[PDB]
Design a protein around this ligand. Structure first.
Ligand code: HEM
Ligand code: HEM
Ligand code: HEM
Ligand code: HEM
Lengths: 146, 141, 141, 146
């Protein structure tokens, strides 16, 4: 995604230090809590009437688990995301009917969860690249709408 | 459009930031300027390089603006009334920028307050900043 | 977030809508399902096909509900709090959809009141539909 | 994009009756009035302080025709909107700094204009077509952001 080496370094460095098991879930829980309408796409998860069961909820953590794997996917497919998320594009759009704004919201949350755990070590410069990564995926994801 | 409980987290969040105010506003601003570079075109004359005393002067002006909003919380159009004339009639800031700035204050606070940036919390500040922006961009004529 | 002038037309417009409120709400609702298919899913228990009866049974509701918001335009968050709980908590509608039904209302109102759809009214109406929307989508948890 | 011969028909049909001297200006006028922050990109045009002011303005009527123009060109290459707008996209994104959401609002203003002119001749089936187009242009124009 036209990123520079600089922006590639700062990233792949901080992604390694990512809790491949707890961040995906931290994100989806946060989306679901702040952008509650996103909850409609997750009835089969069950209890989400409060911020706590949401965060706690296994399925969420279980799902956020996969979601992130897709982010790590492109984070080493930066020259071809449109491809990387084709099927994922076909799912959320044609089959799920998820409004593309939400992808920009989730990734924007993904930047918040990352900004939580890595505090100071998440600098404006880093953000700017991630913001670029999230933009990519986000749009790359909306493609079956292009 | 904020539940009495939201305001609670807004004041326990505002508090835990206190003197960092002017400091964090400057960091919220830099993230915006770097992450979303078009935003720079609204400050033609400024110097927006790191540690720019210009950004920091403004960052605080901004953070003060907020604490003032976190005050007259239910009479916002009126408290922030004047700022609405600057961003809406004089500057005509694309409303999309507000969303950009708000997302940065957020990321700024979750990296400097892990002790208070829990979910129920996060959604409170977002509802808030959004209402803040709605107003500052709500007078356009 | 409106204005004295705005409200005037919102009425001036409603006015020439009068007892057509249901004929229109339908068309808006239909233009919507037609132009934006995803919005359909919010109505599985619905024969959406042209002339659908329940679709019109809805059109009149929505329109009336708007007629309410215009009358109680100064106390909205309140006079429509039953619909927010419905649309935010229960139904859980994406805020993006209120933009579409609103656009389709402006289109509908457009093609049926060529004389009341003046740039300044259009602007007004747009602002009004904007606010109602923030209401019905403002109680999320 | 990709409409259907059913749609391609109703559009090219309707497009014909459009007054290529008023509509473009109509849309650009309402854009400016309804979403006023957009005036910011038009200081060079002069007086725009009131609806009549903006709508009256010939600078606006002038620019409006150019804009309408590009739609016409695009309607003619529904199979290559991305390329058709390639330069305009560099122009609007890299050079002018317009936020893409605004491309979407001009497209919706246009559609309100076609409804205002063509009254009930502008039917749900037709607007649906047009919505496919203006979305297309909107997406096409936004590429230097993709
Ligand atoms: C851009 C960030 C996102 C990524 C990377 C992502 C990724 C994924 C992945 C990898 C799956 C599992 C696919 C499979 O193997 O079956 C999935 C499923 C799903 N996602 Fe997302 N997602 C994102 C955003 C969203 C958003 C914003 C929503 C709606 C609020 C959403 C709703 C769903 C739903 C309902 C499923 C279940 C699909 C099924 O199993 O039938 N996703 N997502
Ligand atoms: C959290 C939302 C925001 C708040 C609370 C805020 C607050 C303020 C305040 C308090 C001032 C100085 C007012 C005065 O003393 O007259 C100001 C000025 C200004 N703001 Fe904002 N602002 C916000 C968002 C934005 C955004 C998104 C932009 C667009 C990039 C923007 C652009 C400007 C500009 C160009 C000035 C004038 C600077 C100068 O000439 O010194 N603001 N703002
Ligand atoms: C102008 C904005 C809107 C207004 C004023 C409005 C108003 C209403 C009203 C008055 C009702 C029925 C209330 C009752 O009988 O208890 C209703 C129901 C409903 N609305 Fe809306 N609405 C709006 C936008 C939307 C949007 C954008 C959607 C999503 C596409 C939506 C989806 C629904 C659904 C699914 C129901 C329940 C239908 C049923 O099963 O009976 N509404 N709305
Ligand atoms: C998506 C629908 C749009 C189309 C098809 C379009 C098309 C055009 C065209 C054909 C030109 C003149 C190019 C030339 O002669 O060099 C132009 C110029 C311009 N447009 Fe747009 N435009 C659209 C939306 C917008 C929006 C939403 C804005 C911001 C509110 C905007 C702002 C401008 C400005 C400021 C210029 C002057 C460029 C210059 O003089 O170098 N346009 N546009």
């Amino acid at each position: 995604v036209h990123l520079t080496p600089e922006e590639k370094s700062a990233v792949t460095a901080l992604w390694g230090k990512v809790n491949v098991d707890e961040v995906g879930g931290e994100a989806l829980g946060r989306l679901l809590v702040v952008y509650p309408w996103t909850q409609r796409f997750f009835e089969s998860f069950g209890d989400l009437s409060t911020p706590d069961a949401v965060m706690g909820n296994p399925k969420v953590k279980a799902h956020g688990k996969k979601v992130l794997g897709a982010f790590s996917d492109g984070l080493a497919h930066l020259d071809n995301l449109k491809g990387t998320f084709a099927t994922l594009s076909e799912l959320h759009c044609d089959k799920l009917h998820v409004d593309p704004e939400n992808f920009r919201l989730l990734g924007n949350v993904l930047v918040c969860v990352l900004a939580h755990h890595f505090g100071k070590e998440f600098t404006p410069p880093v953000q700017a690249a991630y913001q670029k990564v999230v933009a990519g995926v986000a749009n790359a994801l909306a493609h079956k709408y292009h | 459009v904020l539940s009495p409980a939201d305001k609670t987290n807004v004041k326990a969040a505002w508090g835990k930031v206190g003197a960092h105010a002017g400091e964090y506003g400057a960091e919220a601003l830099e993230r915006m300027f770097l992450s979303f570079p078009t935003t720079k075109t609204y400050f033609p004359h400024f110097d927006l390089s790191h540690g720019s005393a210009q950004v920091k002067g403004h960052g605080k002006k901004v953070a003060d603006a907020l604490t003032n909003a976190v005050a007259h919380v239910d009479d916002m159009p009126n408290a922030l009334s004047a700022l609405s004339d600057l961003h809406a009639h004089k500057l005509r800031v694309d409303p999309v920028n507000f969303k950009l700035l708000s997302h940065c204050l957020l990321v700024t606070l979750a990296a400097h307050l892990p002790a208070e940036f829990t979910p129920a919390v996060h959604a409170s500040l977002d509802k808030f900043l959004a209402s803040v922006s709605t107003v500052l961009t709500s007078k356009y004529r």
